RNA sequence: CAGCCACCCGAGAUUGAGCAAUAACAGGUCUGUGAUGCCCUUAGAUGUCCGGGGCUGCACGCGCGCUACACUGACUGGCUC
C-alpha cells in the first residue's frame with residue numbers, strides 16, 4: 001500500500017472552479033409511480049405507523065452495471081454515479097471517514113465503491129455539539145442506529161407513494177438494475193444519465209436518482225425524491241421534541257437537524273441537486289416512545305426546492321465543484337493503479353491510498 | 361408543596377361590571393330637600409310676582425372637544441346589512 005495524496009479541509013474551504021454549464025442529457029430510464037397527498041398531509045396529533053416494505057437493492061458500480069458499461073467506454077472520460085461526488089463535496093462538513101475508489105486507468109477517471117473500514121450507509125449525528133456516547137452494543141450504537149436509519153429510508157421511501165397503483169413506464173428500461181427477473185417489488189426509483197462540462201475532458205457521465213413522481217395540481221410529470229430523518233432520545237445532542245413542535249415550530253426542527261447532521265444533509269442535498277428533481281420531500285420519523293427502537297411513526301412531510309434548500313444548508317455549489325476539480329487534479333498525476341480514498345477518521349483530513357496489485 | 365408553562369378534548373382553559381374593610385381629609389355640597397344650628401333680612405323686604413336686560417359681552421392666556429389638511433380621497437348614482 002502506497003500513500004499518494006493528502007489534503008485537509010482548510011484547503012478544500014478555499015478551492016473553487018465555477019465552470020458548470022446548463023446540463024445536457026444522455027438517456028433516461030426507469031418506470032415511475034405516483035404519490036398520495038393524504039399520506040403527505042399526515043401531521044402532528046394525527047399519527048400513522050411505519051410498516052416494513054421490501055427494498056430491492058440497486059447499488060452497483062458503474063463498470064459492472066450493464067447500462068453504464070455500454071456507455072462509459074464509448075464517450076466521456078470522467079464518470080461518477082449518483083451520491084458519490086458528495087464525498088468530495090462535503091469534505092469541509094464531514095468529520096468521519098468515507099471510502100471510494102477512483103481508478104485512473106489510462107485517461108479514464110471513473111469512481112467506484114470500495115470498502116476500507118467504512119461503509120456507504122447513512123451516518124447520523126456525526127458532527128454535533130456534545131456527540132452521542134455510542135458505547136458498546138447500546139440502543140444508540142453507531143452501526144445499529146445507522147441500520148435503523150437505513151431501515152427508515154428504505155421503508156418510508158416505499159410507504160409514502162401509491163406503490164400499489166399502476167406504475168408509469170418511461171420509454172427506456174433499466175437494464176440489469178433489478179431486471180433479470182421481474183420480482184414485482186421493483187420500486188419507482190429511476191435513473192437518468194446526464195453530462196455536463198467541468199474542465200479537461202470532464203464531461204461527467206453521471207447517474208441520477210428519482211424516488212418517485214408527484215402528479216401536479218394541474219396535472220403533469222413532476223419528479224420528486226423521498227428521504228427522511230429520524231428522532232431518538234431528545235435529551236442528547238441538544239435536541240428538541242418533534243411531537244410537540246413540528247406543527248408550529250418546524251423551522252427550529254430543521255435548524256437543529258442542520259446543526260446536528262451536516263454531512264448527512266449535504267450528502268442528500270448533492271443528490272437532490274444533481275438529479276434536477278422538482279420537489280425534495282423530507283419525512284419526519286420518530287420513535288413510538290423514547291428508549292425504544294424497532295417501532296416508528298411518520299410525523300409529517302415538508303416540500304422544499306432542492307436549490308433553495310441547498311442555499312439553506314449554507315452550501316456553495318461553486319466551491320463544491322471546485323474541490324471536485326481539485327481532487328481530480330490531485331488524482332490526475334496518478335496512474336492505472338486505482339486509489340482507495342480513505343479519509344482520516346479521528347482528525348478530519350482527506351486522504352487516498354494507491355492500491356497495491358489492485359487491492360480491493 | 362402551593363403553583364407556573366405547553367398541548368388534547370372542548371362553546372368556553374383570564375368576558376365585562378356591581379358591591380366593596382379599619383382609619384381618615386377642616387375635600388365638595390347650606391344653590392337637591394317641609395335635613396339643619398347660629399347669624400342676617402322681613403313691607404321702600406335678601407319673601408314673591410310682573411316687564412325689560414344679563415349669564416353669550418372682547419386687545420388676550422388655558423382646558424375638554426368637533427371638522428379638517430385630501431387620491432387608503434371628494435362628488436354623483438347604484439347595491440346591500
Ligand SMILES: [Mg+2]
Nearest residue numbers: 385386387388
Ligand atoms: Mg374647605
Ligand SMILES: [Mg+2]
Nearest residue numbers: 389390392395
Ligand atoms: Mg346638602
Ligand SMILES: [Mg+2]
Nearest residue numbers: 409410411412
Ligand atoms: Mg324676570
Ligand SMILES: [Mg+2]
Nearest residue numbers: 414415416417
Ligand atoms: Mg355659563
Ligand SMILES: [Mg+2]
Nearest residue numbers: 422423424425
Ligand atoms: Mg373634564
Ligand SMILES: [Mg+2]
Nearest residue numbers: 428430434435
Ligand atoms: Mg367639499
